[PDB]
Scaffold this motif. Structure first.
Motif, PDB file in Angstrom:
ATOM      1  N   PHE A   2       3.550   0.209   2.696  1.00 60.30           N
ATOM      2  CA  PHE A   2       3.269  -0.924   3.580  1.00 60.30           C
ATOM      3  C   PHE A   2       3.291  -2.273   2.865  1.00 60.30           C
ATOM      4  O   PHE A   2       3.511  -2.380   1.665  1.00 60.30           O
TER       5      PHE A   2
ATOM      6  N   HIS B 120       0.859  -1.175   0.000  1.00 56.95           N
ATOM      7  CA  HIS B 120       0.000   0.000   0.000  1.00 56.95           C
ATOM      8  C   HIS B 120       0.898   1.229   0.000  1.00 56.95           C
ATOM      9  O   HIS B 120       1.972   1.212   0.605  1.00 56.95           O
TER      10      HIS B 120
ATOM     11  N   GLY C 201      12.268   6.465   6.696  1.00 61.22           N
ATOM     12  CA  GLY C 201      12.304   5.755   5.434  1.00 61.22           C
ATOM     13  C   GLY C 201      10.946   5.607   4.781  1.00 61.22           C
ATOM     14  O   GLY C 201       9.985   6.314   5.092  1.00 61.22           O
ATOM     15  N   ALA C 202      10.874   4.658   3.855  1.00 65.28           N
ATOM     16  CA  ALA C 202       9.656   4.430   3.089  1.00 65.28           C
ATOM     17  C   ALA C 202       8.614   3.736   3.956  1.00 65.28           C
ATOM     18  O   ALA C 202       8.834   2.615   4.428  1.00 65.28           O
TER      19      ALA C 202
ATOM     20  N   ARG D 206       3.755  -3.753   8.534  1.00 63.31           N
ATOM     21  CA  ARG D 206       4.150  -2.357   8.397  1.00 63.31           C
ATOM     22  C   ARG D 206       5.543  -2.271   7.797  1.00 63.31           C
ATOM     23  O   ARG D 206       6.494  -2.846   8.336  1.00 63.31           O
TER      24      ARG D 206
ATOM     25  N   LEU E  54       4.622   7.920   5.717  1.00 63.26           N
ATOM     26  CA  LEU E  54       3.916   8.437   6.888  1.00 63.26           C
ATOM     27  C   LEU E  54       4.657   9.565   7.597  1.00 63.26           C
ATOM     28  O   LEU E  54       4.144  10.684   7.695  1.00 63.26           O
ATOM     29  N   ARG E  55       5.853   9.298   8.101  1.00 62.98           N
ATOM     30  CA  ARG E  55       6.450  10.242   9.030  1.00 62.98           C
ATOM     31  C   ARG E  55       7.093  11.412   8.292  1.00 62.98           C
ATOM     32  O   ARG E  55       7.123  11.470   7.059  1.00 62.98           O
TER      33      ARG E  55
ATOM     34  N   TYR F 243      -2.847 -11.345   8.253  1.00 61.39           N
ATOM     35  CA  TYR F 243      -1.826 -10.630   9.006  1.00 61.39           C
ATOM     36  C   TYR F 243      -1.524  -9.284   8.363  1.00 61.39           C
ATOM     37  O   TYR F 243      -1.479  -9.156   7.137  1.00 61.39           O
ATOM     38  N   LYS F 244      -1.343  -8.275   9.199  1.00 67.86           N
ATOM     39  CA  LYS F 244      -1.038  -6.934   8.735  1.00 67.86           C
ATOM     40  C   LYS F 244       0.438  -6.651   8.964  1.00 67.86           C
ATOM     41  O   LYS F 244       1.006  -7.051   9.983  1.00 67.86           O
TER      42      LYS F 244
ATOM     43  N   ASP G 156      12.607  12.423   7.906  1.00 70.14           N
ATOM     44  CA  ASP G 156      13.761  11.867   8.593  1.00 70.14           C
ATOM     45  C   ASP G 156      13.451  10.413   8.913  1.00 70.14           C
ATOM     46  O   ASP G 156      13.684   9.918  10.019  1.00 70.14           O
TER      47      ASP G 156
END
Lengths: 62, 43, 57, 215, 182, 98, 49, 49, 100
Positions: free
Chosen positions: A48, A34, A44-45, A59, A38-39, A56-57, A42
């Motif tokens: 998801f 996906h 990484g990628a 990140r 997000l952040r 199972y999920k 500073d």
């Protein structure tokens, strides 16, 4: 009553984003992605995963 | 607002007021079963 | 910082004698860790790095 | 034709099957197949020849097993009462206030249909040696102790509440408090000051006995 | 200030009880990570013997009480395994409800007892069992909670510190922290 | 099934198609009204664990059983707020909250 | 800290050695990091003599 | 008091504190609104802040 | 007068009704990480105030590590009082406890 696909049916979503990564909880090598980041920049990628047999999920941290 | 300048008691009756106070004597001890037994005496 | 977004503190001023020499005896200036890149994927730093070779002549 | 007259007996049957599970749980003597009383055999005994049921036929009395009286030393007779009025009257209670008080039971249960008159609610604690527990029969369709999220409650007696408050050196009001109006405290008939025992099947270590007290 | 007391009842700072053992079986999460690694503790038996050294130890604590009352409830539960939860035989409570795990060797919650036994029934090859029932019921004894531990604070940081990760958004039911606030 | 509304009393009347001894919700203040308080406790440790599982953060149940038995100590679903702290003993803790 | 009832409680209750497992999940929190991983594949290889 | 259910200095726990504020919040519910003093007919008129 | 003595005899009757006797102690036989980090704390704060020492200290100036040398060889004259929450207690020694 419309002449185009207004909504899905119970099978009309068959994703195919196969990457050959190892799964620990069900061993399904197939695992989608996906497309996000997000952040603050500073970090990484954050693009998801999601495991595709046992629900199972995953990140993509770094 | 619960006061009267003429009887100088509360507006509630002196058996209704005594009923709540005498429960609060019980509930400053560690007992709640005997607090709801005071409403078993109404004659 | 380089011109691709790679910040970083000058972690330790390292003596030039215990620092790897090169082809000629060139010693470098800024050691950046190659573990920094795969979270960044700044390949623009890699192609800048060899075109600085190919601009220096 | 039988529009309401199919549901109103089927709902009343499981309501009756609830009550013969609410009495057996408290310690009384109800038989096995009376708990499992079949609807086919139900209507051929407790319904009229026109197919309608009369609840005056349905009322009964239960007496405790004397093994449970070896644990609860004074457990009197239980009377199960029903009501054939959707509007319970205050004088309908006066029939049933006296019928408990005259016959000298210990425990009383009144089953009703839609509502009780609030004027009839004045007569509920007015027999001080006895107890009256009302129940909406539309609220007793399914037993709420068979459901998986509710653990098996067990009420305790005096020779193990004393083996509790001396074990953990507690007071009475230091345990986790269960309400008076809780539909399990209304099920087992918990007085104030009676510790119930919950064996909750924990999600980590299986069966886990916890205790809880009614205030 | 919710802390474990010296008889394992989870009690708030003013005595008002909360739980009766910590989480069911009174184990810190920071010690249990090998507690169901029965394959591992068989392998390194002799090293893990003299870490959990029973020589100067098993004479100061009760031994043969919890080994016997458990096997009532191991045998008595084999009757009512095919039963629903309301029909359960409610005579016998678990072994921890009578016996302190810090004192009685072999007193073990009902999920760890059934998993050593399933290890001692399936995978038994020259593998003994009385050599191994000692250690993996003594390791359960050593890996209990510490009476006095701040499980009021520690639980409240098991809701706090992962929660700086769950601001993720839409690819119904409320999700993340605006669910958790409710 | 999944029902976008909470009404236990009418679902009992649908017994021929629903097993009525397995129904599970998220409205804890409705389970407390109908199914006692002990099922209002087992729902909370499910509904908290239904948030940390979707993000795959396995918090241990020993932390959640303590929280759910703190909210359900008075027989009612007490929140953690100003109204939930109103029953307490140590009164500097009340002053030092807000 | 400034007293010896605290120098034992900065060694035997709250050092970075009893803090090996986090209580949130039991997972370990301390381990090499970036290049100390990528030296293991080169040190414990079968060509590294 | 002859039992150990209380002391001279009394017992005060969370649920007893719960059962104490409920009366006082209801005691201050009833006395605030009334028609007359009811020792008598001798009553006082209302007040306003 | 004796209004101190009537004030005193009540306490020593109260303090005797809370000591659980030695044949009836019912807590762990272990030193549960909180005795151990405090027994070593307080004993190290006694050697800094000229307590009598009972070990061959081997040039170990560090006042904390001296108590560990006496902890692993059982020379500590301390007694742990573990308060059960009603007020009762069990005066465990340091010999009869078993270290990790």
């Amino acid at each position: 009553k419309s002449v185009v696909k207004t909504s899905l049916k119970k099978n009309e979503l068959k994703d195919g984003a196969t990457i050959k990564e190892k799964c620990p909880q069900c061993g399904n090598e197939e695992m989608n992605y996906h497309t996000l980041q997000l952040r603050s920049a500073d970090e990484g990628a954050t693009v998801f995963y999601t495991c595709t047999s046992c629900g199972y999920k995953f990140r993509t941290n770094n | 607002r619960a006061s009267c300048l003429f009887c100088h008691h509360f507006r509630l009756k002196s058996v209704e007021v005594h009923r709540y106070a005498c429960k609060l004597r019980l509930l400053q001890y560690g007992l709640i079963d005997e607090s709801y037994k005071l409403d078993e005496i109404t004659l | 910082s380089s011109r691709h977004g790679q910040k970083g503190v000058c972690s330790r001023k390292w003596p030039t004698i215990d620092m790897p020499f090169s082809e000629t005896g060139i010693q470098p200036d800024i050691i950046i860790n190659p573990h920094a890149f795969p979270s960044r994927m700044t390949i623009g730093m890699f192609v800048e790095s060899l075109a600085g070779k190919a601009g220096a002549l | 034709m039988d529009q309401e007259n199919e549901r109103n007996i089927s709902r009343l049957w499981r309501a009756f099957r609830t009550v013969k599970e609410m009495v057996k749980d408290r310690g009384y003597f109800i038989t096995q197949e009376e708990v499992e009383l079949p609807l086919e055999d139900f209507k051929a005994k407790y319904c009229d020849s026109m197919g309608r049921p009369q609840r005056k036929m349905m009322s009964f009395q239960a007496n405790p097993t004397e093994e449970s009286i070896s644990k609860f030393p004074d457990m009197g007779s239980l009377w199960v009462e029903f009501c054939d009025e959707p509007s319970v009257g205050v004088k309908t209670m006066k029939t049933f206030v006296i019928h408990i008080q005259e016959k000298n039971f210990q425990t009383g249960i009144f089953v009703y249909q839609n509502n009780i008159t609030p004027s009839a609610m004045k007569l509920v604690p007015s027999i001080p040696p006895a107890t009256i527990e009302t129940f909406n029969e539309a609220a007793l369709v399914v037993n709420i102790t068979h459901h998986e999220l509710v653990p098996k409650h067990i009420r305790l007696s005096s020779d193990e509440k004393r083996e509790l408050l001396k074990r953990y050196r507690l007071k009475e009001s230091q345990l986790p408090r269960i309400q008076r109006a809780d539909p399990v405290a209304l099920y087992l008939g918990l007085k104030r000051g009676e510790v119930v025992k919950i064996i909750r099947k924990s999600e980590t270590s299986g069966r886990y006995a916890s205790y809880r007290i009614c205030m | 200030g919710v802390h474990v007391s010296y008889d394992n009842s989870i009690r708030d700072a003013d005595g008002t009880l909360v739980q009766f053992m910590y989480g069911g079986d009174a184990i810190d999460i920071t010690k249990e990570s090998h507690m169901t690694q029965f394959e591992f503790c068989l392998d390194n038996y002799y090293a893990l013997l003299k870490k959990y050294n029973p020589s100067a130890l098993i004479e100061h604590l009760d031994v043969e009480s919890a080994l016997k009352y458990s096997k009532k409830t191991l045998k008595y539960r084999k009757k009512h395994s095919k039963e629903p939860h309301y029909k359960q035989s409610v005579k016998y409570d678990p072994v921890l409800a009578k016996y302190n795990p810090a004192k009685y060797l072999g007193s073990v919650s009902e999920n760890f007892q059934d998993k050593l036994e399933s290890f001692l029934d399936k995978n038994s090859k020259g593998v003994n069992e009385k050599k191994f029932r000692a250690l993996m019921q003594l390791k359960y004894m050593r890996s209990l909670i510490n009476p006095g531990e701040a499980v009021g604070i520690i639980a409240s940081q098991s809701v706090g510190e992962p929660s700086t990760q769950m601001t993720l958004n839409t690819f119904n039911v409320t999700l993340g922290i605006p669910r958790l606030r409710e | 099934l999944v029902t976008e509304g909470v009404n236990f009393q009418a679902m009992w009347d649908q017994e021929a198609f629903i097993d009525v001894d397995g129904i599970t919700s998220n409205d804890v203040a409705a389970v407390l009204k109908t199914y006692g308080v002990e099922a209002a406790r087992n729902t909370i440790v499910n509904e908290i664990n239904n948030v940390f599982s979707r993000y795959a953060i396995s918090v241990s149940f020993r932390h959640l059983d303590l929280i759910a038995d703190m909210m359900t100590r008075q027989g009612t679903y007490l929140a953690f707020n100003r109204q939930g702290m109103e029953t307490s003993t140590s009164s500097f803790m009340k002053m030092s909250y807000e | 800290p400034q007293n010896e009832n605290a120098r034992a409680e900065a060694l035997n209750l709250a050092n970075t050695d009893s803090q090996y497992l986090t209580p949130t999940s039991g997972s370990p929190v301390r381990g090499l990091i970036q290049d100390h991983i990528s030296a293991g594949v080169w040190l414990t290889s079968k060509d590294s003599f | 008091l002859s039992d150990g259910r209380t002391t001279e200095r009394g017992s005060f726990t969370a649920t007893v504190n719960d059962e104490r504020k409920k009366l006082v919040h209801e005691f201050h519910k009833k006395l605030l609104s009334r028609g007359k003093c009811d020792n008598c007919g001798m009553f006082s008129p209302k007040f306003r802040k | 007068p004796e209004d101190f003595q009537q004030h005193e005899q009540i306490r020593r009757k109260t303090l005797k009704e809370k000591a659980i006797p030695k044949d009836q102690r019912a807590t762990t036989p272990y030193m549960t990480k909180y005795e151990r980090a405090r027994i070593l704390g307080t004993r190290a704060l006694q050697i800094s105030m000229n307590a009598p020492v009972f070990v061959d200290l081997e040039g170990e100036t560090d006042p904390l590590r001296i108590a560990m040398k006496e902890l692993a060889e059982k020379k500590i004259p301390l007694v742990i009082r573990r308060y059960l929450p009603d007020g009762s207690f069990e005066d465990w020694s340091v010999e009869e406890l078993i270290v990790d």
